[PDB]
Amino acid sequence: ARLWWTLDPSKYYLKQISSGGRNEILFTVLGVTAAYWYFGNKRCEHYWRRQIDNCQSWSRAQNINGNNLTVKQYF
Amino acid sequence: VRLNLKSNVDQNEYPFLAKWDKDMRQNYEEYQNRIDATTYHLQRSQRGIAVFGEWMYPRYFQKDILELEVLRRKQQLGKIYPEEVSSYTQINPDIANDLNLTFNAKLLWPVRGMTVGAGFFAFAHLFNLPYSFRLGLFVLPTAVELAFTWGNKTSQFKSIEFMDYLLQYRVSKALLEKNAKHFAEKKAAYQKEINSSQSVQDLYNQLITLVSEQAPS
Amino acid sequence: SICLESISGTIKGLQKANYVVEHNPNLTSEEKKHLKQFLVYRYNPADPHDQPKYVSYWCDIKKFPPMFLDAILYIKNELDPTLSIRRSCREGICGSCAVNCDGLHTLACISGFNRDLSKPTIITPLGHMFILKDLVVDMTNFYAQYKMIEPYLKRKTPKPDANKEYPQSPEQRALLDGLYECVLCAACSTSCPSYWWHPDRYLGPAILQQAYRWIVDSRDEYTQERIERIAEDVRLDDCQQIGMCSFTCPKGLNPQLSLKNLMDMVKDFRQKRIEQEVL
Amino acid sequence: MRRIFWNFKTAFVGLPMFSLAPKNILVYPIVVGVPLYTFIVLQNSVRGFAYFDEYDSDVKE
Amino acid sequence: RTKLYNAAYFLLNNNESFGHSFGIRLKIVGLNTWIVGYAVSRYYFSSLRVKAAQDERF
Amino acid sequence: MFKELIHIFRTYFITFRYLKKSNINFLKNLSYTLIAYYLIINFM
Amino acid sequence: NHSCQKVFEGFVSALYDTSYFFRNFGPFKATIHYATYANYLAQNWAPRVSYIETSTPAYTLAKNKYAVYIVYGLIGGALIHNYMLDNKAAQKSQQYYLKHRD
Amino acid sequence: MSLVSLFKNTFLKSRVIGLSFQAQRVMAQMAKTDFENPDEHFLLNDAMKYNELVFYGRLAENWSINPELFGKAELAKYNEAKQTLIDFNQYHALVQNLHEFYWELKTIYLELSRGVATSNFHNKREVTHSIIESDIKNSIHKYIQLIDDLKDYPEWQHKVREEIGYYAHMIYTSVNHDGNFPEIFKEFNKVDSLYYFK
Amino acid sequence: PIRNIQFARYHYLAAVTVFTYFATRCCLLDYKKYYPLASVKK
Amino acid sequence: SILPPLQYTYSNEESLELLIHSIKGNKDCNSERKAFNLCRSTVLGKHVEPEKCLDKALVFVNCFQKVRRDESAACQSAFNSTLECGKKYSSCQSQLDAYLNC
Amino acid sequence: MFSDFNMYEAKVFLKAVADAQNTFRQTAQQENQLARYESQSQSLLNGSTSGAISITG
Numbered sequence A: 001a002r003l004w005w006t007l008d009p010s011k012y013y014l015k016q017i018s019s020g021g022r023n024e025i026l027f028t029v030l031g032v033t034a035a036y037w038y039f040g041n042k043r044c045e046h047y048w049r050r051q052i053d054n055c056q057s058w059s060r061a062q063n064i065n066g067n068n069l070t071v072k073q074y075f
Numbered sequence B: 001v002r003l004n005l006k007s008n009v010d011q012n013e014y015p016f017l018a019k020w021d022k023d024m025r026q027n028y029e030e031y032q033n034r035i036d037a038t039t040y041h042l043q044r045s046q047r048g049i050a051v052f053g054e055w056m057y058p059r060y061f062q063k064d065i066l067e068l069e070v071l072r073r074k075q076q077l078g079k080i081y082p083e084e085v086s087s088y089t090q091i092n093p094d095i096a097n098d099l100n101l102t103f104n105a106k107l108l109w110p111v112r113g114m115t116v117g118a119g120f121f122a123f124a125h126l127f128n129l130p131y132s133f134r135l136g137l138f139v140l141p142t143a144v145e146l147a148f149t150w151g152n153k154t155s156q157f158k159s160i161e162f163m164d165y166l167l168q169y170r171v172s173k174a175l176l177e178k179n180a181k182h183f184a185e186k187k188a189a190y191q192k193e194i195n196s197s198q199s200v201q202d203l204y205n206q207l208i209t210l211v212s213e214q215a216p217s
Numbered sequence C: 001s002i003c004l005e006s007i008s009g010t011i012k013g014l015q016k017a018n019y020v021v022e023h024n025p026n027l028t029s030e031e032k033k034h035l036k037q038f039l040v041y042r043y044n045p046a047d048p049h050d051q052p053k054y055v056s057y058w059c060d061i062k063k064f065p066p067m068f069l070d071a072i073l074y075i076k077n078e079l080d081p082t083l084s085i086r087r088s089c090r091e092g093i094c095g096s097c098a099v100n101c102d103g104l105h106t107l108a109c110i111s112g113f114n115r116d117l118s119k120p121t122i123i124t125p126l127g128h129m130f131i132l133k134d135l136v137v138d139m140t141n142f143y144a145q146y147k148m149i150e151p152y153l154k155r156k157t158p159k160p161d162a163n164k165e166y167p168q169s170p171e172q173r174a175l176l177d178g179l180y181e182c183v184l185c186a187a188c189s190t191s192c193p194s195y196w197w198h199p200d201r202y203l204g205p206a207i208l209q210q211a212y213r214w215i216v217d218s219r220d221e222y223t224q225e226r227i228e229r230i231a232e233d234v235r236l237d238d239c240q241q242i243g244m245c246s247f248t249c250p251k252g253l254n255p256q257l258s259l260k261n262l263m264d265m266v267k268d269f270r271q272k273r274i275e276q277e278v279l
Numbered sequence D: 001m002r003r004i005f006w007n008f009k010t011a012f013v014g015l016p017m018f019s020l021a022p023k024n025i026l027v028y029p030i031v032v033g034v035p036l037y038t039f040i041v042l043q044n045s046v047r048g049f050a051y052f053d054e055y056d057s058d059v060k061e
Numbered sequence E: 001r002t003k004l005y006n007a008a009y010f011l012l013n014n015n016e017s018f019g020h021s022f023g024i025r026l027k028i029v030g031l032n033t034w035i036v037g038y039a040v041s042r043y044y045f046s047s048l049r050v051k052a053a054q055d056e057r058f
Numbered sequence F: 001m002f003k004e005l006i007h008i009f010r011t012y013f014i015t016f017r018y019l020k021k022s023n024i025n026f027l028k029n030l031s032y033t034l035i036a037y038y039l040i041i042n043f044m
Numbered sequence G: 001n002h003s004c005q006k007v008f009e010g011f012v013s014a015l016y017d018t019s020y021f022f023r024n025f026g027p028f029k030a031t032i033h034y035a036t037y038a039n040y041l042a043q044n045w046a047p048r049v050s051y052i053e054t055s056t057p058a059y060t061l062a063k064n065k066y067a068v069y070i071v072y073g074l075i076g077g078a079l080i081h082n083y084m085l086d087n088k089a090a091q092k093s094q095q096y097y098l099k100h101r102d
Numbered sequence H: 001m002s003l004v005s006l007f008k009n010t011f012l013k014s015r016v017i018g019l020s021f022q023a024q025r026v027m028a029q030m031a032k033t034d035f036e037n038p039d040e041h042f043l044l045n046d047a048m049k050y051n052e053l054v055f056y057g058r059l060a061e062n063w064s065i066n067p068e069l070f071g072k073a074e075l076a077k078y079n080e081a082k083q084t085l086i087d088f089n090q091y092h093a094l095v096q097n098l099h100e101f102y103w104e105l106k107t108i109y110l111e112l113s114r115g116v117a118t119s120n121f122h123n124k125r126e127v128t129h130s131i132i133e134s135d136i137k138n139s140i141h142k143y144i145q146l147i148d149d150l151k152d153y154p155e156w157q158h159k160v161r162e163e164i165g166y167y168a169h170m171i172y173t174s175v176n177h178d179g180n181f182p183e184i185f186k187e188f189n190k191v192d193s194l195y196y197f198k
Numbered sequence I: 001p002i003r004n005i006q007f008a009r010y011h012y013l014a015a016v017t018v019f020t021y022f023a024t025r026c027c028l029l030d031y032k033k034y035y036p037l038a039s040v041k042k
Numbered sequence J: 001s002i003l004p005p006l007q008y009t010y011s012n013e014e015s016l017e018l019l020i021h022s023i024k025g026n027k028d029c030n031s032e033r034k035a036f037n038l039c040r041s042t043v044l045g046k047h048v049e050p051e052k053c054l055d056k057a058l059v060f061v062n063c064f065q066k067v068r069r070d071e072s073a074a075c076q077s078a079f080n081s082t083l084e085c086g087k088k089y090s091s092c093q094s095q096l097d098a099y100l101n102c
Numbered sequence K: 001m002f003s004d005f006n007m008y009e010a011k012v013f014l015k016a017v018a019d020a021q022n023t024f025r026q027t028a029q030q031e032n033q034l035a036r037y038e039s040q041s042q043s044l045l046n047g048s049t050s051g052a053i054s055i056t057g
């Protein structure tokens, strides 16, 4: 036809499990628990950070070969 | 901020410093204009309402914070020379590739995609496929290489690291030329009586720990 | 092997033939024009030296009746007998002579070519159907699609009279009135864009209208089965309610309305299969 | 070869197509594109379009 | 050795039904292509390299 | 959206008819998974 | 085509045989079978909220008439609790680093 | 103690018998569906225990149960269910092979069709090449042999002739009667040609 | 008799709007093009 | 984890005081600050020879410290009023404008 | 809160203040690095001269 835009869900996926409604409360509990674990560590990292400069935070740079990084003035 | 292009460096006693200052002042206008444009974009985005800005800021405007940082760092280093790039290959190889991917140095022709498409063209010319398929299987690998080449923002972080390293190297090298005259007398004696290419900053720390461990104390 | 030369020939082909987009050879050499110009399509896929070859005939309008089929018969009887065309009924009832009568898919016999001598009139085959000969397409793919819809009365249960007629009444007779008059001329199908793109998986306006006629037949008790047969893949869904299947019907039928009602029944059929099947 | 047959200027694929495609393709971009874009652009400038000039640029050597 | 037909829209005269239906179709396809093209353009102009110096090479 | 997009691809592009609806329904699953992943990560 | 048609046939037959071997090689066949069923379960039996309630209202579980509000309450509570925890963590961090600033 | 064994056996018997009840419906629906995408109406309209039926049929034919937990009637019902699932697996293999042959014929037809479309300015060839003719001949021979093999099943023979033979008819309509046409379609122009008004 | 038909409609509309928001960045413009046509302060 | 970490922990009172003093300085010490930024823009003055910028930096910091002292009684009163308004804020533009005129 | 103009005044002024503090730090660190390197070089040369440390590579 020429009229296909509807917000109504497709009846193909509108089926239902034989033991009640679609498993949503279980999956939303799992998602909330996952969200608490995930948005519980980024909060910990965000608010417990400070930036310090001491001349002790610096360490000698090294190449991929392990030896110290020294670049000559004229290469 | 409207820095005049002519530099005040001697250019006959500190050639490296004069060249660096000339390159810094020469490209200052373009990078300053781009920085101003990016800052205006950030300000106007902050000025937005709800999901149009002031809510998704600066968390979702991360592609222009990076651009502003790269622009400022590259504004400090007017021009990067190929000699100074190779040194950073000691730390990170393919740094030239990252700089090409981030800094518009040249036109990144998809060599890999073009040669893969030519490989498809060879097979499509053996068990003959239509030239429509030949054109499609030539465009496809070139498009793949273009997709995997452009948009690489990790190359921008690698270039930020390289630009910080090169800024520090140029600052230190600038001090070397300023004090080269003063240390000429001591350098001869130090080199002639201490046969070692190790840095004084590195040799002295060995002496410090050596005295710390084995000394009459 | 045969690829690169073929590509070069075809790219050079249409580009060198898009300029000459109508060949228009002339049957003869004429000077004074008191005659209507007929550009009749000509193509005989039996000799290697033949291509679509619009032929410009000149002939007096008065000498034959004002019908496209009469004009073609005048052309194919006196001037160029090599022309071919299907025609039997001469009354617009068999559907044999369906051709493209000056940019329109209508029956040749029940049709009137324009009387303006200055403007030439062009006659072409039915269009999006393979060309067997001049103006003679093969509607065998159409005919075959008529076989799939099971266009015969199918009764689930018998009648107790066993010696009388199926009770249909005049009102229920009118339901299939306006649906059974189709002459299977296939002029709407060849002018229906959904049929242009999917001649295989789309039955077509005429065939779906025949299916609707058998569905709304009062005596027929296989409505659900026929709906199921037509409500599969894009057999019916491909119709886009464009409305050109009704604009070009020489018999005045309404294939657009028939297919609209068929799609309405199908949409209800999908819903009815859930509401009426739950225990 | 490819003996194309095409009624120029009297056909759906031709001059009518040229006249029809721009007027219908540019419907939503011109009936919901311009208003939405204007709203999004001008919602920021509730008080002005001015660029707060950080990094000076008012100073000259 | 193949059967060549006619496109049946190169020869059919334009009709109001053709115009209306393909106008609706082109309206919807234009909306969708405008949305997708805006997304692609935002992707494209946000993946462009920063400006180099006048003589910068690597 | 996906239904009519696939219908548009099938109607006009002949070579899209090479894909049976088994493959198309696999593209449907992949597209739905990609959309869900995109929506999830854009908030992370 | 030409003599290369034999090479074309060999290549296509090799591709067909490799596909056939990969598909129904016992372990690969088993894992593809299980993956197909897992994909069906994921796509078709996703945790929806809207579904056809064919059963009469005297038969529908109260767990199904309130699952929408349970889901909405859980999600909204999680969001507001995350916001409150972020505020509390911000004030705690500020107070802690003010105490340790001295 | 044997919780794992008890759960495995009850799960297998439950799924197997439940899908055995709802198996003839699925097979009948697959019979109604065209050979092109026989699994359609399950991807689109209702997946009424189709994928579950395939998966658990393969499991039942490739798993084992402990008859200690089963009763006599339970074991008889389970064995009948397993036989029905195995028959469904064989039926699915048959319809899949028929569908793949249908798609072979449809690939031939699409190769012909792409050479006639007006959008095909890429390659316009008047005469079909040799290998496509050989493929047409071989596929028509295979289709004739398939029809002959289905002589004991008139309904299946009719379905195959209606569905698979339709694209053979389409290939017939797409080619002129020139060159080796009588030889290529010699097997087709005996019985099934007249089925499509030829 | 679909349950939560209003909720399903709202969820589909919200998902479409969010996707078009993030895939197109329509509401999050870049004003570097508008920077030249602006009057600076200070 | 993407927002930059804080270096110096500022209380609310200290942050508001620094805000208001910085605004006053930019409205008062604008010329010295601009001169200092002019010196600190080139490679020499920013990286290689910060010794040159010492005097301009000292002038700017002295001006900022004079602003922070705000020895005027009216300045002290208006600043305290603006600080009270800001702390109640956990608006204030009229109070700020009244203060800055002093 | 204040007007965005005042907030950006504060932003640029605080940028200048941080830059001034970094300037103080840079000057002090550079002069003392010069002194430190001179002292370390003198210590190494004196140690090697008086036969107190043997440097091999």
Ligand SMILES: COC1=C(OC)C(=O)C(C/C=C(/C)CC/C=C(\C)CC/C=C(\C)CC/C=C(/C)CC/C=C(/C)CC/C=C(/C)CC/C=C(/C)CC/C=C(/C)CC/C=C(\C)CCC=C(C)C)=C(C)C1=O
Pocket (backbone or CB within 6 Å): C193, C194, C240, C242, D012, D013, D017, D021, D022, E009, E017, E018, E019, E020, E021, E022, E023, E025, F011
């Ligand atoms: C229900 O619904 C309905 C359907 O559906 C089911 C239907 O089917 C139908 C049936 C009727 C139909 C008409 C259907 C047929 C459909 C089509 C034919 C679709 C195609 C038509 C359109 C989409 C409408 C036409 C309008 C437009 C805008 C399409 C595009 C048209 C153009 C002319 C192209 C755009 C123009 C330009 C100039 C773009 C240029 C792009 C470039 C890349 C060129 C760059 C130029 C340069 C100078 C740079 C490059 C230069 C170089 C490289 C140097 C040169 C060197 C070289 C080597 C080249 C109906 C009625 C219907 O109702």
Ligand code: SF4
Pocket (backbone or CB within 6 Å): C181, C182, C183, C184, C185, C186, C187, C188, C189, C205, C206, C209, C248, C249, C250, C251, C252, C253, C255
């Ligand atoms: S419905 Fe009309 S136009 Fe169509 S085939 Fe029948 S008589 Fe001809």
Ligand code: FES
Pocket (backbone or CB within 6 Å): C069, C086, C087, C088, C089, C090, C091, C092, C093, C094, C095, C096, C097, C098, C107, C108, C109, C110
């Ligand atoms: S000859 Fe019968 S329809 Fe015209």
